[PDB]
Structure 1
Amino acid sequence: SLSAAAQACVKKMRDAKVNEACIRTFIAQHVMVSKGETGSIPDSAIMPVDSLDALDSLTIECDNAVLQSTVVLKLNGGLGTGMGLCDAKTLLEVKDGKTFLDFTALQVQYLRQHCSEHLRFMLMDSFNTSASTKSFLKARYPWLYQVFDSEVELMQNQVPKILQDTLEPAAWAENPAYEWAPPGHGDIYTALYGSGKLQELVEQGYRYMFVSNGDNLGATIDKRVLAYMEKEKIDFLMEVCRRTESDKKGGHLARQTVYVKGKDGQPDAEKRVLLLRESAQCPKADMESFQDINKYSFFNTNNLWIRLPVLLETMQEHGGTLPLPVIRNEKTVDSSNSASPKVYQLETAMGAAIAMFESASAIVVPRFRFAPVKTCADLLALRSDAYVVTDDFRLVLDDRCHGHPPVVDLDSAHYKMMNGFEKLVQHGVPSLVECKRVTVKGLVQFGAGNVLTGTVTIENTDSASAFVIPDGAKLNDTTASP
């Protein structure tokens, strides 16, 4: 039986007609929090992962049946606040005239032409992103618009922000919509389960789901991973990348060792169990451990494969929920207004489901399956010539890079927001394919047709006037200044 605060959350969520699967999932988290769970995972509690299988080693492709039983879902529900976005990130342009959505739709169109005619495609939208996404598709891809509401969109849940003082639901008279937030992308499982969509998918014969970040345009179906999951009877698979210097916003793989004591004269066998640690779960006093890319060198791509019938079985057998570890995220009710009440927002990360299945694994993938965009520094690298468009409409790092993205460092005073970054490339995106690292300090504007090679720094000490670069400039292993 629940605390008074937890009952106040149930009542609020029921009055608003929140899905019961979501209420159950949230309340189980609310119980954890009220007992002192923060989501924190300290370094002393985990150990690094030393060896995994690699996609580059695999060669066998899955038969057509398996391919036909796969569904593709793109996450599209978050708000990239750090980039100063008030709408769906996937609408920003990534190449001249084309948005993340554009390439996403082109990926689906191509796959339907060349691999599986009846590929099921889904987008997980939220309150904050559904509107703009649907009208975009209405204009450019009517074949998706026709079945948007019918089979494309999965709407994610909203859960109450809770006051830190009491764990009660927050009230915000000035704008009650701010009392609610989407509960991270680990909600995909809840939303699929609670809407009946997961059982429908299983009923129609689908067996696998391939999920990836909306911002990652290298993530598509690779039939060798499906063959691999079939052979090895794997129910959940996380693709990880060898971590680079640019991999600082996200989570890394880790392991624990659980001892299953062996019966009948067979000794207790240590058995590895895998887990995800998001940056938000690192005790912030230990961030340097989280950020040491040698210690934890397997970075989650969020390219995730789920065996749908087993996910469904597992959630049925855990009270109609998937008990992902809660992440207790701290904010104010109006995140803009730091005079507003402090709240917790309970969230989960979908890659945390690796701890949920007995035969969950991770596989190392090459960097051409991971081109993330968390910051405008990423968007600069993606927009430039360091990233190329494949025939099947993935963006991938050019071969010259040897799987190392150009290390982009933009002054956060000027380029952290989208409006500032937009002026930086006002007159052109620099050629970056040959740039191992570009650092921009102070207010600066690229010219047209700039070529950067080696380690280039552009610096303006003056901090008043823009340092503008002349068309044609080619900076090589240098620091450029007014």
Structure 2
Amino acid sequence: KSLSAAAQACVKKMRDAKVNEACIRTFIAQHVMVSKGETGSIPDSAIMPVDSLDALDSLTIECDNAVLQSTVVLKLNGGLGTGMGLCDAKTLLEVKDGKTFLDFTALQVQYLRQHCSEHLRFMLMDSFNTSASTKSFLKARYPWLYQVFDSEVELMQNQVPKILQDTLEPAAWAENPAYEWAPPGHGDIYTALYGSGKLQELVEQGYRYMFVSNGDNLGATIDKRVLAYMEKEKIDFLMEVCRRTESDKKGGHLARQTVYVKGKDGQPDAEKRVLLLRESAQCPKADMESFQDINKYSFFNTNNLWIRLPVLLETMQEHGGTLPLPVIRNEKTVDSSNSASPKVYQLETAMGAAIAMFESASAIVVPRSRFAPVKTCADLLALRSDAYVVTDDFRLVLDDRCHGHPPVVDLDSAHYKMMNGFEKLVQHGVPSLVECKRVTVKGLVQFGAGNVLTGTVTIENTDSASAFVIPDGAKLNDTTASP
């Protein structure tokens, strides 16, 4: 009904493949935007810094029991960790000896069920890539989650067609047609919830809040103070943000614009702050200077998000059965491996962008303890190290000796970008980093078995025709060590 041939070709392919209609409506609206020149770019000049938020450490009151019992926890688990050379779910990586992201995730759920709300609802948003392996893991390790995996745990994200940059038609790939489809980013959570009927089912069952976080962030759990704050302040969507550090490069920051409140009765001048998310992908590429300036944009989205479910549901129903999140136009080739395969756009959205979709939306500053991202092998190095400790409620948080500062880890991306390269680097043990402010690894190198790094430490191999192996027991303090 009024679409371009290319947009109609997408609808047809999606209907043929039995893609849920909410996903088709959502995708097509993005497609229309893209056909009018939209890229998701948010230039510097269109936004301003946010310089005032409440902090969670300013709160004390915990929510009532009804509210608590009404809260569902969901962990995102649909991505690929392709920058870490992973082909399966990142959450199946080991984080501490013999314990994976999924283990700590399951243990957190069990803790909450033993001490807070015995029937706390727990979900995982999976994709076709991660579903099987996740389900398999829970069957072996956490039978009580496996038993209700299909019925209540797993939410399956949609897949949407990759579209040719040429014409915006759906891309075909005869050698492997599965590569014609892509996951639409974690912003798809709202569309998959709504289109599957699970959102309405949850609201029917008496659930009122959902707390979502990234599968790679084991600092995130429900804080009953946030829920009491959302109840008091009548907030329908809340983003947790952390004060941004130099390591916060892959993700998004909070920003504002100013709008002008209803009408002009009383005075024209008065205006309201509107909040939004800018992902790295949304910064104009020749202006990453805007994005990477941690002073200017110092509130980094953790992706720990709180949503009031009935409000989400009514907002989507009243907007054509979709949530109109800003499209992010990702550029790839249809076989991302093969740069001789046709160039495509992959239309995606980020779930934190939903802060722009509700009148009551806000953000709160949380301590770093709620944010332990693992986007790279360098992050994983810190996480596995004694810089991070396991709390009684099964979060991974910095040791108190760190003073809330994660070690900065700068690993050579020729050798350690891929999980195969990283794992060779820590073959003989993971170095103590609890007292390291900054470790930098240059050229090919291998840690020894006793290592302890204190202060600022560069390990530089200029040779790397030959691996620079660190002696066991070695101690490096404010020093460059080289062969």
Say yes or no: TM over 0.5.
Answer: yes
8 Å CA contact retained: 1:236, 1:307: yes
Secondary structure at the residue paired with 1:74? strand
Secondary structure at the residue paired with 2:472? coil
Deviations 1:145-190 (A, max 9, x none): 0000000000000000000000000000000000001100000000
CA RMSD, aligned part only? 0.6
How far residue 283 of structure 1 moved from its aligned partner, in angstroms, is 0.3
How far residue 269 of structure 1 moved from its aligned partner, in angstroms, is 1.3
Do residues 277 (structure 1) and 278 (structure 2) align?
Answer: yes
How far residue 262 of structure 1 moved from its aligned partner, in angstroms, is 4.1
8 Å CA contact retained: 2:210, 2:306: yes
For structure 1, which segment, 182-191 or 266-275, has the greater mean C-alpha deviation from structure 2 after superposition?
A: 266-275
Aligned counterparts of 2:404 and 2:389: Cα–Cα separation in 1 = 13
How far residue 264 of structure 1 moved from its aligned partner, in angstroms, is 3.0
Aligned counterparts of 2:472 and 2:213: Cα–Cα separation in 1 = 38
Secondary structure at the residue paired with 1:73? strand
How far residue 204 of structure 1 moved from its aligned partner, in angstroms, is 0.3
8 Å CA contact retained: 1:261, 1:268: no
Do residues 64 (structure 1) and 65 (structure 2) align?
Answer: yes
Deviations 1:304-354 (A, max 9, x none): 000000000000000000000000000000000110000000000000000
8 Å CA contact retained: 2:386, 2:434: yes
Aligned counterparts of 1:120 and 1:479: Cα–Cα separation in 2 = 50
Aligned counterparts of 1:176 and 1:62: Cα–Cα separation in 2 = 49
8 Å CA contact retained: 1:314, 1:322: yes
Secondary structure at the residue paired with 1:177? helix
With the length of structure 2 as denominator, give the TM-score of the two structures.
0.99
Secondary structure at the residue paired with 2:352? helix
How far residue 205 of structure 1 moved from its aligned partner, in angstroms, is 0.2
8 Å CA contact retained: 1:262, 1:269: no
Aligned counterparts of 1:145 and 1:215: Cα–Cα separation in 2 = 20
Aligned counterparts of 2:242 and 2:262: Cα–Cα separation in 1 = 33
Secondary structure at the residue paired with 1:5? helix
Deviations 1:70-97 (A, max 9, x none): 0000000001100000000000000000
Secondary structure at the residue paired with 2:132? helix
8 Å CA contact retained: 1:257, 1:270: yes
Residues matched between the structures, number: 482
Aligned counterparts of 1:316 and 1:476: Cα–Cα separation in 2 = 59
8 Å CA contact retained: 1:125, 1:156: yes
Secondary structure at the residue paired with 2:80? coil
How far residue 261 of structure 1 moved from its aligned partner, in angstroms, is 5.4
Aligned counterparts of 1:169 and 1:17: Cα–Cα separation in 2 = 16
Aligned counterparts of 2:128 and 2:431: Cα–Cα separation in 1 = 36
Aligned counterparts of 1:422 and 1:430: Cα–Cα separation in 2 = 13
Indicate the residue corresponding to 2:383 in structure 1. Answer: 382
8 Å CA contact retained: 2:216, 2:374: yes
8 Å CA contact retained: 1:260, 1:268: no
Secondary structure at the residue paired with 2:260? strand
How far residue 427 of structure 1 moved from its aligned partner, in angstroms, is 0.3
How far residue 265 of structure 1 moved from its aligned partner, in angstroms, is 2.8
Indicate the residue corresponding to 2:118 in structure 1. Answer: 117
Aligned counterparts of 2:342 and 2:219: Cα–Cα separation in 1 = 40
8 Å CA contact retained: 1:261, 1:269: no
For structure 1, which segment, 179-188 or 393-402, has the greater mean C-alpha deviation from structure 2 after superposition?
A: 393-402
Aligned counterparts of 2:324 and 2:32: Cα–Cα separation in 1 = 12
Aligned counterparts of 2:162 and 2:203: Cα–Cα separation in 1 = 33
8 Å CA contact retained: 2:160, 2:183: yes
Aligned counterparts of 1:88 and 1:400: Cα–Cα separation in 2 = 31
How far residue 289 of structure 1 moved from its aligned partner, in angstroms, is 1.2
Aligned counterparts of 2:314 and 2:430: Cα–Cα separation in 1 = 49
Deviations 1:230-256 (A, max 9, x none): 000000000000000110000000000
Aligned counterparts of 1:323 and 1:30: Cα–Cα separation in 2 = 12
How far residue 399 of structure 1 moved from its aligned partner, in angstroms, is 1.3
How far residue 122 of structure 1 moved from its aligned partner, in angstroms, is 0.2
Aligned counterparts of 1:286 and 1:49: Cα–Cα separation in 2 = 19
Aligned counterparts of 2:313 and 2:462: Cα–Cα separation in 1 = 58
8 Å CA contact retained: 1:76, 1:126: yes
8 Å CA contact retained: 1:387, 1:397: yes
Secondary structure at the residue paired with 1:269? coil
Aligned counterparts of 1:245 and 1:453: Cα–Cα separation in 2 = 19
How far residue 463 of structure 1 moved from its aligned partner, in angstroms, is 2.0
Unaligned residue ranges in structure 1 (runs of 5+):
none
Aligned counterparts of 1:401 and 1:472: Cα–Cα separation in 2 = 22
1:46-57 aligned at under 5 Å gives the runs 46-57=47-58
Aligned counterparts of 1:67 and 1:33: Cα–Cα separation in 2 = 41
Aligned counterparts of 1:157 and 1:370: Cα–Cα separation in 2 = 27
How far residue 263 of structure 1 moved from its aligned partner, in angstroms, is 3.7
Indicate the residue corresponding to 2:395 in structure 1. Answer: 394
Aligned counterparts of 1:244 and 1:263: Cα–Cα separation in 2 = 41
How far residue 288 of structure 1 moved from its aligned partner, in angstroms, is 1.2
How far residue 401 of structure 1 moved from its aligned partner, in angstroms, is 1.4
Secondary structure at the residue paired with 1:231? helix
8 Å CA contact retained: 1:164, 1:343: yes
Secondary structure at the residue paired with 1:315? helix
Deviations 1:25-62 (A, max 9, x none): 00000000000000000000000001100000000000
With the length of structure 1 as denominator, give the TM-score of the two structures.
0.99
8 Å CA contact retained: 2:445, 2:464: no
Aligned counterparts of 2:410 and 2:376: Cα–Cα separation in 1 = 10
Secondary structure at the residue paired with 2:230? helix
Aligned counterparts of 1:62 and 1:167: Cα–Cα separation in 2 = 48
